[PDB]
Amino acid sequence: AFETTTPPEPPQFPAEGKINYVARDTILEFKALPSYSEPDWITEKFEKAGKLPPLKERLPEEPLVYKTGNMPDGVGVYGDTMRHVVGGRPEGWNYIAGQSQGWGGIDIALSECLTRTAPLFQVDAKDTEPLPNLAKSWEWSEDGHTLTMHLVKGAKWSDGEAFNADDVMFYWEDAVVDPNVSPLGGGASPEAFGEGTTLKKIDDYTVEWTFKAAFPKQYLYTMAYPSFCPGPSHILKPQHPKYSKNTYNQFKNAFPPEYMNMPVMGAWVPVSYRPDDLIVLRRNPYYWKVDEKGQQLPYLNEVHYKLSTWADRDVQAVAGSGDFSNLEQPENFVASLKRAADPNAPARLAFGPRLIGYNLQMNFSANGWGNPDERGQAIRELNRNEVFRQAVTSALDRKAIGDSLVKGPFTAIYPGGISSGTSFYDRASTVYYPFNLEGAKAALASIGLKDTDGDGFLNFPKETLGGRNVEITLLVNNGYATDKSLAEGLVGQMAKLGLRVVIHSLDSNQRDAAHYGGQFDWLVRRNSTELSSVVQNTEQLAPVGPRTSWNHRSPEGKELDLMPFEKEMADIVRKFISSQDNAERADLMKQYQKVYTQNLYTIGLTEYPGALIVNKRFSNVPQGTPIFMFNWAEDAIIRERLWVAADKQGKYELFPQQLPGKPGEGGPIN
Numbered sequence: 006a007f008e009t010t011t012p013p014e015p016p017q018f019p020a021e022g023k024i025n026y027v028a029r030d031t032i033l034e035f036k037a038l039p040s041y042s043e044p045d046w047i048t049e050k051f052e053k054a055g056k057l058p059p060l061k062e063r064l065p066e067e068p069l070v071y072k073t074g075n076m077p078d079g080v081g082v083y084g085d086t087m088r089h090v091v092g093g094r095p096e097g098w099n100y101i102a103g104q105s106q107g108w109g110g111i112d113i114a115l116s117e118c119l120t121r122t123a124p125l126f127q128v129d130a131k132d133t134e135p136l137p138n139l140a141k142s143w144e145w146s147e148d149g150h151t152l153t154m155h156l157v158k159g160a161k162w163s164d165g166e167a168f169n170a171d172d173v174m175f176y177w178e179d180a181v182v183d184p185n186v187s188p189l190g191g192g193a194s195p196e197a198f199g200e201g202t203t204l205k206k207i208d209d210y211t212v213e214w215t216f217k218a219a220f221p222k223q224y225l226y227t228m229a230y231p232s233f234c235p236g237p238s239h240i241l242k243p244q245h246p247k248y249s250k251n252t253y254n255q256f257k258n259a260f261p262p263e264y265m266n267m268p269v270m271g272a273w274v275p276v277s278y279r280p281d282d283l284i285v286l287r288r289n290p291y292y293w294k295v296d297e298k299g300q301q302l303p304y305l306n307e308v309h310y311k312l313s314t315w316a317d318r319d320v321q322a323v324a325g326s327g328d329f330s331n332l333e334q335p336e337n338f339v340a341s342l343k344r345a346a347d348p349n350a351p352a353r354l355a356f357g358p359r360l361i362g363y364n365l366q367m368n369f370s371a372n373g374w375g376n377p378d379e380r381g382q383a384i385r386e387l388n389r390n391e392v393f394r395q396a397v398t399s400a401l402d403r404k405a406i407g408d409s410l411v412k413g414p415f416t417a418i419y420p421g422g423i424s425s426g427t428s429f430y431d432r433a434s435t436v437y438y439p440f441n442l443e444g445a446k447a448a449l450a451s452i453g454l455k456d457t458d459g460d461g462f463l464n465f466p467k468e469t470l471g472g473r474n475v476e477i478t479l480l481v482n483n484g485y486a487t488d489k490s491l492a493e494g495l496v497g498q499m500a501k502l503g504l505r506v507v508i509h510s511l512d513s514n515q516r517d518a519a520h521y522g523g524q525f526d527w528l529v530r531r532n533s534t535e536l537s538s539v540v541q542n543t544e545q546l547a548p549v550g551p552r553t554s555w556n557h558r559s560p561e562g563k564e565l566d567l568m569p570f571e572k573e574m575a576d577i578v579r580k581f582i583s584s585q586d587n588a589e590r591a592d593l594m595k596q597y598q599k600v601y602t603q604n605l606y607t608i609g610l611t612e613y614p615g616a617l618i619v620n621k622r623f624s625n626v627p628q629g630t631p632i633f634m635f636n637w638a639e640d641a642i643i644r645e646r647l648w649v650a651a652d653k654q655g656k657y658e659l660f661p662q663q664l665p666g667k668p669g670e671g672g673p674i675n
């Protein structure tokens with residue numbers, strides 16, 4: 006019906022900062038060092054005062070040692086604070102039960118995972134193994150169905166309680182496997198680690214995975230952020246409904262933001278909170294990572310999370326009151342670039358590849374995900390019709406969408422699928438539906454949609470909903486100008502097509518509950534890592550499991566009503582996950598891209614590059630760090646390895662020479 010092509014080449018972006026590519030094992034290693042050191046005030050005011058055990062005792066036998074060769078500026082010195090500004094608000098501290106801490110790096114900093122992938126932007130190979138993190142090493146069996154995972158041994162939580170396999174097993178069994186619990190990020194279902202995957206304890210520092218497929222090495226990426234980040238079981242397990250009289254809601258809400266010094270495996274601990282103002286994190290004295298000189302990390306003693314807006318993060322970073330920003334809203338690009346143009350600017354700004362994409366996602370579940378009424382179900386059936394999706398995508402003037410956010414070389418024509426900024430992208434495999442409004446109007450008439458009341462808007466046939474006008478709800482995040490602008494644009498464009506679209510503008514936490522719960526027709530969404538990197542959370546590319554897809558989930562317990570193209574997509578993703586051949590993998594992502602964009606798994610809105618804004622006083626910030634690839638730049642820059650020269654240090658500490666207090670007390674100890 007439509008004359009498809011490939012998307013036109015965008016204006017050549019000279020992608021600012023260049024990456025110094027290194028091999029995978031240049032960053033870190035696990036080993037015992039002859040001696041260890043820490044800030045002098047800890048030894049003098051805490052150890053010598055009998056307030057804290059000596060350093061060698063608080064550390065594991067073989068801590069994670071950062072190698073100096075990879076450090077952009079070398080070994081650091083202690084002091085200073087990294088100041089962050091966020092548009093999110095904390096729900097509480099129960100990350101594994103799906104509670105958000107406010108985003109913008111806070112949960113990234115608090116929740117350490119089995120593996121780590123965000124610093125992999127600097128490693129050149131599409132067959133790279135994720136970095137060891139809480140899992141120090143792992144071995145595959147000869148058949149490739151068994152994965153033996155060795156954990157960091159002798160490490161402790163920020164409260165001094167031992168970290169071991171029991172924390173890993175409580176997360177797997179009582180957060181992932183438990184159907185009533187949904188960990189933060191919305192992708193921690195058991196099938197995300199493969200359908201039929203089991204995990205068992207061997208001993209206190211050894212776990213064993215059993216997979217149906219042979220060598221599905223891609224699941225090591227799923228073991229990174231956000232899907233495998235264990236919580237303190239000694240604190241969380243007594244609150245869990247299986248071991249208490251608590252409901253699942255009571256367990257999820259057992260640790261509100263006012264609960265202080267929540268145990269973490271991260272570099273800093275939350276010590277202070279003031280509603281709609283600030284969150285203060287203080288150095289974790291039990292942190293299990295050190296530099297080559299034996300200095301216990303982090304170098305920075307404090308971290309601030311100012312509770313403001315996402316736009317204000319860009320404002321404060323160029324002004325110098327904030328130290329970091331991911332410039333990701335095109336409406337803020339010109340104002341930020343003008344301010345960064347000054348040689349006296351306190352921060353540096355660098356654009357990366359086009360890895361920020363937006364998609365229109367349609368709910369594909371006709372089996373009752375989100376318990377829809379007669380109207381909702383009729384929309385599910387329209388969404389599932391290929392001709393309907395072809396009309397919606399063809400009715401979008403993508404050049405006008407791009408220009409509505411920012412004029413210039415930033416935006417690129419984005420039909421949907423894999424981001425043009427990743428190596429796995431193939432332009433020739435991307436199906437582009439050019440702007441054809443008349444063809445789109447004709448396509449809808451061809452499936453029995455016509456204006457029966459004379460208002461120009463199309464009606465359902467007499468048999469469906471009494472022949473009333475078609476009305477579609479559109480779920481949006483109200484925290485961003487970009488999301489709102491795209492939602493408003495979609496309403497106006499669909500009105501030209503004869504479709505009435507109604508905005509459902511919700512805050513981040515309400516938006517997540519409506520999305521993951523299936524209570525939506527359509528939704529405007531910024532892409533996650535699977536479309537910007539392919540290799541990070543590959544299971545989210547298709548409905549490989551009942552809850553792995555963002556737009557096609559099944560309610561527990563009903564089976565997935567997959568359309569043939571979705572099953573073809575699920576087979577390609579499964580093949581790629583278990584593929585050991587680089588040429589085969591590249592080819593599978595070409596097939597995937599073709600199936601996705603021809604059948605319109607989602608509908609692309611726009612794609613553009615983001616910019617990393619970092620305060621100039623910070624040392625060890627890697628050159629060319631993207632804002633978003635394997636994860637957000639807050640993770641990619643390795644914040645525990647950042648330092649400031651003594652003569653350049655700011656005096657921003659709110660709890661100087663203080664350490665975190667006890668969980669549920671009492672603020673910092675002093």
Ligand SMILES: OC[C@H]1O[C@H](O[C@@H]2[C@@H](O)[C@H](O)[C@@H](O)[C@H](O)[C@@H]2O)[C@H](O)[C@@H](O)[C@H]1O
Pocket residue numbers: 093108109110111113315331333482513517637639
């Ligand atoms: O976590 C680090 C990021 O936090 C923010 O994104 C959040 C926010 O959009 C939530 O509402 C979503 O639920 C979540 O998925 C998403 O990552 C920043 O915009 C981004 O630049 C980066 O700092």
Ligand SMILES: [Ca+2]
Pocket residue numbers: 455456457458459460461462463464474
């Ligand atoms: Ca009508």
Ligand SMILES: [Cl-]
Pocket residue numbers: 072073074075
């Ligand atoms: Cl080295």
Ligand SMILES: [Cl-]
Pocket residue numbers: 093094512513514
């Ligand atoms: Cl909120």
Ligand SMILES: [Cl-]
Pocket residue numbers: 094
């Ligand atoms: Cl708010």
Ligand SMILES: [Cl-]
Pocket residue numbers: 246251252253254
């Ligand atoms: Cl319950």
Ligand SMILES: [Cl-]
Pocket residue numbers: 262263264265266275276277278
């Ligand atoms: Cl607090």
Ligand SMILES: [Cl-]
Pocket residue numbers: 094095279280281282312
């Ligand atoms: Cl708040």
Ligand SMILES: [Cl-]
Pocket residue numbers: 355356357358614615616617630631632633
């Ligand atoms: Cl970037």
